[PDB]
Amino acid sequence: EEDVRILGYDPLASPALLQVQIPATPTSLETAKRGRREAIDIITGKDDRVLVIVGPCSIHDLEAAQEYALRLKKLSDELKGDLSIIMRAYLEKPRTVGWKGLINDPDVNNTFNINKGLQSARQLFVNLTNIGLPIGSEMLDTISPQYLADLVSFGAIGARTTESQLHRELASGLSFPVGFKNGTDGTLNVAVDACQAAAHSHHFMGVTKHGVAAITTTKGNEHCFVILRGGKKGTNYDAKSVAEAKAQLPAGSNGLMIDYSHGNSNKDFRNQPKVNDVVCEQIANGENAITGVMIESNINEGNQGIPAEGKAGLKYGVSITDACIGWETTEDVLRKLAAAVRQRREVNK
Amino acid sequence: AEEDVRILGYDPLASPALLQVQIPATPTSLETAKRGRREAIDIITGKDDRVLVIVGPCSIHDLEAAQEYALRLKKLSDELKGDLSIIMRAYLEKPRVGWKGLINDPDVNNTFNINKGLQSARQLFVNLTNIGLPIGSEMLDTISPQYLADLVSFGAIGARTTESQLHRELASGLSFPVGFKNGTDGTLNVAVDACQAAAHSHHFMGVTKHGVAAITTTKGNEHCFVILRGGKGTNYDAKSVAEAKAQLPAGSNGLMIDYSHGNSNKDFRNQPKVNDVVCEQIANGENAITGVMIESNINEGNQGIPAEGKALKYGVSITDACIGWETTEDVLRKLAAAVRQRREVNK
Ligand SMILES: [Mn+2]
């Protein structure tokens, strides 16, 4: 007696199969490799620029996500001297009611279609990296990465998974930098331990490119950093917290990342520009522990819901999960930030 | 196309179906597992006035010592079966800088041999359930359960994974009761939300009995309860259980109290104390307290692995500290009485 709570198994196209059906262009693969290099240099102290993971809370519209990417691309060219921008192309959010994500519900209609979900996911990632814009995503499980890893330049383990052994081992084998968010209870200890663990070699059970379960063995990831995203103990994007933080980072730690939205906003997306100001000062005055910022942005501000009128009737450019600043304001943030960096170069010059 | 740069390689892995044939479950084993699930379900849902007790080593690393313990616990289980419903602990590992647990380093010599690990794991579970003693284990990943689910009567999601979506969906499809431990920061909200989620139906990617990745769909598990194990302070006191019962939504199952970890704050000798403070609330008529987790062994304390390998002191855990057998015999006879006395207060 088992599976009594298992309604059934549906066939799942393997990674290898998907990687052929939706191939990565030479440009796409190049953009991904570049992003990883830049990201690595910045978090390890080799580059004085600031790593910026900015983009929608979650993509549900490949059309709108492509428009946004173009804009963000044209900008990244201009502020490339001070900011290395990776676009947020998260494929969901850890809901509890609400949507499931571009992979669980690609059609936004409670009609699960994982296979089509993975196709959209992969297609999307290819479309974005194809125009020369690196992308970052959240590492949900130990399988999804196999279908998209080749195109990702940055990966972030959510706040509710940083303590999870399973996600630490997963990070210890990813081919890019992985950011661990601090505990949902404001503490920074668990994220420091995640980075410690991901640095080691692990032996876990995963699936191959051919959809088969196998004993995986990782090398260890040394490009794991901490992301500050607030918590119960209050937001932590300020100098005082940044210092408490630096104080906890062990020997050989990488540069800290500060997520403007989420716990560092207190259910008010209009606080991101505020945080930017505070963080931009620390930077403008020689703070070199602050290496990257995480921004939840979009084409139009705010959030919304999934109307009774199916997907066909959803305000365009507007998130359907966490709320975010709109384009206009995003470019501001990125210009004061671009300055905070250009400045910083002197404080240390 | 840069990939697998941090992947040293993939080793072949015997599938669940394969393992289930190489190490078959006796008719007795399968019966013991089904019984335990029934009893556990009745107790946490309020249909039975007994107390569910998940007691046993912090983690098994010796199948021979684990078998001796099971015999003792079995006999005791017989004497106090009128009050307690005993489910032996069969954890393969502890919250990871030391031994990686039976599945990973089965030979206890820093070598990774997962296939032999799974064989020991499964063989063990069979040996235990084979003498009529139900077992409970921690649900590590979304694969290991496939190799052992058929023999497990109870499952617990650790404190470091209760917030993990992946483990909530996993629980929503297990064939037995799953206990969620409260956050490591003493809060009880995350565990209440885990239970909420596991109750729903989920669509995740898992592996079949044939080692293949497939889109799994769960029914939802309604036998998910909360376990109080302390945190940043403890929480087995009446003031804490009272604040807990608050947080549980209508129709929630009886809480479970862990006498160890955060509730024994840096010492195993703190379990007997926690048993009084819990036995009391039971005799005084507290009905939310449906079960307890006890970390015991054949001999007190823990230890480590010497310059020498698995020969280690006998009957002693090599991870978290345990109480001895005798202490365990008292602790359980005492918890038994508190159960009878609670039987009156309600009458
Ligand atoms: Mn978000």
User: Per-residue DSSP letters for A134-194?
Assistant: -EEEE--SSSHHHHHGGG-SEEEE-TTTTT-HHHHHHHTT-SS-EEEEPPTTS-SHHHHHH
Kindly give the residue spans of alpha helices, DSSP state H, lying in chain A. Answer: 15-21, 26-44, 62-78, 114-130, 144-148, 165-171, 189-198, 239-248, 272-284, 327-347
CB A155 within 8 A of CB A179: yes
Query: What b-and-e string marks burial along A237-248, b requiring 16 or more CB atoms within 10 Å of the CB?
Result: bbeebbeebeee
Closest residue in chain A to residue B14, using alpha carbons only: A214
CB B291 within 8 A of CB B257: yes
The experimental technique behind this entry is: X-ray
- Provide long-range contacts, Cβ within 8 A and 24+ apart, for B285-288: B285/B342, B285/B345, B285/B346, B286/B238, B286/B241, B286/B342, B287/B46, B287/B254, B287/B342, B287/B346, B288/B241, B288/B244, B288/B245, B288/B248, B288/B254, B288/B255
Distance CA A285, CA A242 (A): 14
CB A239 within 8 A of CB A287: yes
Ordered by start, the domain boundaries in chain A are 1-349
**Helix (H) or strand (E) run with residue B86 in it:** strand B84-89
For B260, residues 6+ apart whose C-beta sits below 8 A from its C-beta are: B229, B268, B270, B271, B274, B293, B294, B295, B320
B194 by DSSP, 3-state: which?
A: helix
B184 by DSSP, 3-state: which?
A: coil
- Closest CB to A96: pick one of B196, B208, B213: B196
In a 13 Å sphere around the CA of A107, the CA atoms on its Cβ side amount to 10
Provide the shortest C-alpha distance from residue A349 to chain B (in Å). 36
In chain A, residues with a C-beta closer than 8 Å to the C-beta of B205 are: 12, 114, 141, 143-144
The residue whose two tokens read 């403070």 is: B277
Tally C-beta pairs within 8 A across A and B.
179
Query: What is the CATH superfamily name and number for domain B1-347?
Result: Aldolase class I (3.20.20.70)
B289 by DSSP, 3-state: which?
A: coil
- Closest CB to A175: pick one of B2, B30, B174: B2
Q: Is B23 exposed, middle or buried (0-12, 13-18, 19+ CB in 10 A)?
A: middle
- Cα distances (angstroms) measured from residue A225 to each of A103, A189, A313: 27, 12, 40
Interchain contact, B221 vs A173, CB within 8 Å: no
Instruction: Give the resolution in Å.
Output: 2.7
The distance between the two most distant Cα atoms of chain B, rounded to a whole number of Å, is: 71
Interchain contact, A216 vs B3, CB within 8 Å: no
Report the relative pairing of strands B7-11 and A213-218 from DSSP bridges: antiparallel
**CA-CA-CA-CA dihedral for A142, A146, A147, A150, to nearest 10:** 130
Residues B211, B205, A134: CA angle, nearest 5 degrees: 115
For residue A297, the 8-state DSSP code is B
In chain B, residues with a C-beta closer than 8 Å to the C-beta of A10 are: 214-215, 217
One-letter identity of residue B161: T
The residue whose two tokens read 């840069």 is: B2
Of A77, A78, A82, A85, the C-alpha closest to A47 is: A82
Sheet with B213-218, strands from edge to edge, namely: A6-10, B213-218, B203-207
Q: What share of chain B is helix, strand, coil (3-state, %, to 5)?
A: 40, 15, 45
Closest residue in chain A to residue B172, using alpha carbons only: A5
Interchain contact, B201 vs A115, CB within 8 Å: no
**Protein residues placing their CB within 5 Å of the ion ligand 1:** A 57, 322
CATH-assigned architecture of domain A1-349: Alpha-Beta Barrel (3.20)
For A297, residues 6+ apart whose C-beta sits below 8 A from its C-beta are: A54, A55, A56, A88, A324, A325, A326, A327, A330, A333
B120 by DSSP, 3-state: which?
A: helix
Number of H helices, E strands in chain A: 10, 11
Of A295, A314, A306, the C-alpha closest to A76 is: A295
Interchain contact, A143 vs B112, CB within 8 Å: no
CA–centroid distance, A262 to ligand 1, in Å, is: 6
Beta strands in B208-344 (DSSP E): 213-218, 224-228, 256-258, 291-295
- Cα distances (angstroms) measured from residue A208 to each of A104, A143, A176, B217, B330: 21, 9, 18, 21, 50
